[PDB]
């Protein structure tokens, strides 16, 4: 503990993801909406807008 910054122990956590190239299992808190047919809509399917 007596040492200054630059030598003190640092805990590092690396979060690694992949972008859209597989079916997704971890998602955000966003709520699911109902589906509408035959109308022009801006949709968001699993992070694909």
């Amino acid at each position: 503990p007596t040492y200054g910054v630059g030598h003190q122990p640092y805990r590092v956590v690396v979060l690694s993801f992949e972008l859209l190239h597989a079916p997704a299992t971890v998602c955000g808190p966003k709520k699911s909406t109902n589906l509408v047919k035959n109308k022009c809509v801006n949709f968001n399917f699993n992070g694909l807008t």
Binding site: L19, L20, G47, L48, T49
Partner: protein, 49 residues
Amino acid sequence: ALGKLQDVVNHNAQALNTLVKQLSSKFGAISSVLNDILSRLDPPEAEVQ
């Protein structure tokens, strides 16, 4: 017999197909989809992509 006229048709569609194909090119960016870039990055780095 009618190779010349078909060749002109062949060139035109191919040019459009190539131009359409160019939409699937990353061009040195993280993704080729603009919506993903907007949905994934802050404007300072999204502007670069």
